[PDB]
From a paper:
BK polyomavirus (BKV) is an opportunistic pathogen that causes severe diseases in the immunosuppressed (Bennett et al., 2012). As expected, the BKV capsid has a T = 7d quasi-symmetry, and is built from 72 pentons of the major capsid protein VP1. Each of the six distinct conformations of VP1 present within the asymmetric unit of the capsid shares a common core fold, which is the β sandwich, “jelly roll” fold, characteristic of many viral capsid proteins. Crystal structures revealed that polyomavirus capsids consist of 360 copies of the major capsid protein VP1, which form 72 “pentons,” each consisting of a ring of five β barrel-containing VP1 monomers (Nilsson et al., 2005). Together, these form a T = 7d lattice, with a C-terminal arm from each VP1 making interactions with neighboring pentons to stabilize the capsid shell.
We present the 3.4-Å cryoelectron microscopy structure of native, infectious BKV in complex with the receptor fragment of GT1b ganglioside. Owing to the low concentration of our virus samples and low affinity of polyomavirus:receptor interactions (∼1–5 mM) (Neu et al., 2008, Stehle and Harrison, 1996), to study the BKV:GT1b structure we implemented an on-grid soaking protocol, where a 20 mM solution of the oligosaccharide portion of GT1b was applied to the carbon-immobilized virions for 30 s prior to blotting and plunge freezing. GT1b is a branched oligosaccharide, described previously as having “left” and “right” arms (Neu et al., 2013a). The disialic acid motif located on the right arm, of GT1b is well resolved in the 3.4 Å map. The binding mode is similar to that seen previously in a structure of GD3, an oligosaccharide that lacks a left arm, bound to a BKV VP1 penton. The left arm of GT1b is poorly resolved in our structure, indicating that it is not ordered at high resolution. To examine the possible location of the GT1b left arm, we emphasized lower-resolution features in the map by applying a 5 Å low-pass filter to the 3.4 Å map. This revealed bridges of density between Asp59 and Lys83 of VP1 and the GT1b density, consistent with previous mutagenesis data of these residues (D59Y and K83A), which resulted in significantly reduced BKV spread in cell culture (Neu et al., 2013a). MD simulations show that the left arm of GT1b is dynamic, explaining the lack of high-resolution density in our EM map, and its previous intractability to crystallographic studies. Low-resolution EM density and MD suggest a likely mechanism of binding for the left arm of GT1b, in which multiple, weak interactions occur with the VP1 surface.
Author numbering:
A (entry chain 2): 14 to 359
B (entry chain 3): 16 to 358
C (entry chain 6): 311 to 359
D (entry chain 1): 14 to 52
Write the structure that this text describes.
């Protein structure tokens, strides 16, 4: 009979599955879609109370402030190992993965409608006080770890041992201080109150975040599977995965949970991620003399000689002779190249 | 001299749900209009759309809510016909939800301040409905696959509600072992189930949450809004089964009684879905009908596990083509999976 | 051998947090099954006992 | 099989550093990016 119209050519799914699926030898124009999540690291004050913090210390002195480790929300971070694009390119070309498109979402937003759960009674015969207060929703997707900046308040706070902090803070550390650069290289260590992502150094990641701080503000959360964030820059490239690794970071403080006794503690939710990848032809920016210099420096013996480089060097004169010239009248002449051209002092 | 009238797509038949079973042309557009009543708990027969009054300070150890208090998801299924007549092997011809146009019915009912609301101050009127609210809808060709995230995993739920099974402290956050579909009305409470951000490949769910102790419900009401259900490939939710699935959950705020006992308020939600006929590759050919026939006539074997977490298949080498002989039989694929990086 | 070693959340192994990986290669006529399920009976359901 | 394309032409980075790059003489069609802060 009458045949239907030909269906539109969609991309062909090869294999769906878990993380073991990435190993498939595909072609050049393959695209993968990694779907994952991150759990919030809110402090977890005992084994029964995951996702909350410990209760807040109310009024510490500004000089003798010493918080504890269980009441500090920290950043979440993770590395997704990607397989190598083992190819046979010419003239110093490669292939790397490119984070083209992220599609994120907070998992568990309607759980905040639980009002019969030890929350503070809202009025005389009311229900429970819902979760509200200062909230912070952050996510960062890139091919390198999240390079961040240590900016805090009250540099005289005595942090505990588990949390990694800005090293030797001064009064300058209560505003921008260039000495407090660090990476995000550890889950559940870097607290949110000390570490903002570095606006000067995240050349390979794409970090997005918003903050709203009040005594009682509404946590407004949208949930949708059609929103889509493009991770491309002005040149049309995304986060390139230098080492075959995809770095995913997040921080989702949703508000303060007020207990029945009137004692507040934080609340965090998970964060879905969906990164769309592809294979980018790049060039090798580095010469072959970086491969061979690393091979030699781990097979040749380390010699503790006399210093032949530095401020106490023992090499006195080096002269480079290339090409022929007419005989100059000054043998004790001095010759070099200043900025671009050959110069000749005396 | 005036011109001819413009070409408008010709209406054929208007009516109820029985218009669906009419066999039409292949280039036919169907606009189904329906609604969903809120399953807010309904504490007795004379009070619909409310919930029961809220319990206040049940601690985490001993927390047992009641059945009529928890607002649950609304869902329904719209029976669509089957469209092929002969085999026509290769391509098939399914429905496709192109455009939803939704709306909450009854938003000006919240102007009723002479009802059982609490007196707002010394001689004022009633206190309006405000507080935590959540407006949600989903349109797809599958039931709304959803993820179980709650707080207070030691909550003892009633028997009427279906909840995430065997919760741990990991269930107070994202736990992968709480997958379920939305195939039952008034049993999946909203405080336990968010729609699954990974597994809904055939629905289009839309939702806004707005917490807070007293925030205004802001509800627009318009018949010129239009939501496009197409993905980045240009296809809407295909109806695999001969059915269209419609889900919603409308919480509009807390109704404060004269005694002070707060209780929820929900409203209905309009749906206007455009359906066209799209030609797809047949997911159920003769070979599927063959293999499903021999499936049902084969003896069930309860043997040792060969799939899942406790699986006993160790290694599968799938290999098809030919290859020049490698210099590495166990060729490494990840340069560094576990991490032999610096510092 | 020069990248910073992060110690993050388990994105590999038994306790992995990657939920799903799709891999696409070429073009295909539009399937009528958007969750392209392969096993006609993976669990063993709808077999005769 | 199928070979991947050539890489995309991006603007060539020349020199990266602190304040001392704001002394270097550059070309006519040179595009600098000054990154700074104010306390
Ligand atoms: Ca920079
Ligand atoms: Ca998915």
């Amino acid at each position: 009979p009458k045949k239907p119209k030909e269906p539109v050519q969609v991309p062909k799914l090869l294999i769906k599955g878990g993380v073991e699926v990435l190993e498939v030898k595909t072609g050049v124009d393959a695209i993968t879609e990694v779907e994952c999540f991150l759990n919030p690291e809110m402090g977890d004050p005992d084994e029964n109370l995951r996702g909350f913090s410990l209760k807040l210390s109310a009024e510490n002195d500004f000089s003798s402030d010493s918080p504890e480790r269980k009441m500090l929300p920290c950043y979440s971070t993770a590395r997704i190992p990607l397989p190598n694009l083992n190819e046979d390119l010419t003239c110093g070309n490669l292939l790397m993965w490119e984070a083209v498109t992220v599609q994120t979402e907070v998992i568990g937003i309607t759980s905040m409608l639980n009002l019969h759960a030890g929350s503070q009674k809202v009025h005389e015969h009311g229900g429970g006080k819902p979760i509200q207060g200062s909230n912070f929703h952050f996510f960062a997707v890139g091919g390198d770890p999240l390079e961040m900046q240590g900016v805090l308040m009250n540099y005289r706070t005595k942090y505990p041992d588990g949390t990694i902090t800005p090293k030797n803070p001064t009064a300058q550390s209560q505003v921008m201080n260039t000495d407090h650069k660090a990476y995000l290289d550890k889950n559940n260590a870097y607290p949110v109150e000390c570490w903002v992502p570095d606006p000067s150094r995240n050349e390979n990641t794409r970090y997005f975040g918003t903050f709203t701080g009040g005594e009682n503000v509404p946590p407004v959360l949208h949930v949708t599977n059609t929103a889509t964030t493009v991770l491309l820059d002005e040149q049309g490239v995304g986060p390139l995965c230098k080492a075959d690794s995809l770095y995913v970071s997040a921080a989702d403080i949703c508000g303060l949970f007020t207990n029945s006794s009137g004692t507040q503690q934080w609340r965090g939710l998970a964060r879905y991620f969906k990164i769309r990848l592809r294979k980018r032809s790049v060039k090798n920016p580095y010469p072959i003399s970086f491969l061979l210099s690393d091979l030699i420096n781990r097979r040749t013996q380390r010699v503790d000689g006399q210093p032949m480089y530095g401020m106490e060097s023992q090499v006195e004169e080096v002269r480079v002779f290339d090409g022929t010239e007419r005989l100059p009248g000054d043998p004790d002449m001095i010759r070099y190249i200043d900025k671009q051209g050959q110069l000749q002092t005396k």
